[PDB]
Amino acid sequence: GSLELCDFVTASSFCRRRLPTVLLKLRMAQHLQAAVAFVEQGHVRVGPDVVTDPAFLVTRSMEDFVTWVDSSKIKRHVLEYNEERDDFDL
């Protein structure tokens, strides 16, 4: 759009782009304190890299490539619930 929408940017817009709240949008977490907690142990990666800083704004392009890190206990539970655990892929 035009410059009209440019006057709506506030602290809320910046807070919505934080890494923990994106997990909360993506339904990877259901509570903010749980979403924050997942980050520092290192269960969450943005592409190849693992991000431990809760204060981290993720781009729209990078938002497509956020997922559980491999060899994480949470990813085991997701695969177990879906009956799709394959131990060859570790």
């Binding site: 602290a11 809320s12 919505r16 709240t21 909360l24 949008k25 903010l32």
Partner: peptide
């Protein structure tokens, strides 16, 4: 100021709100 964390608008923009409604 941001809304309450329990609010859905905390993590949803107007595009998501239109589709979710």
């Amino acid at each position: 100021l941001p809304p309450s964390p329990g609010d859905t608008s905390y993590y949803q923009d107007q595009v998501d709100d239109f589709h979710e409604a």
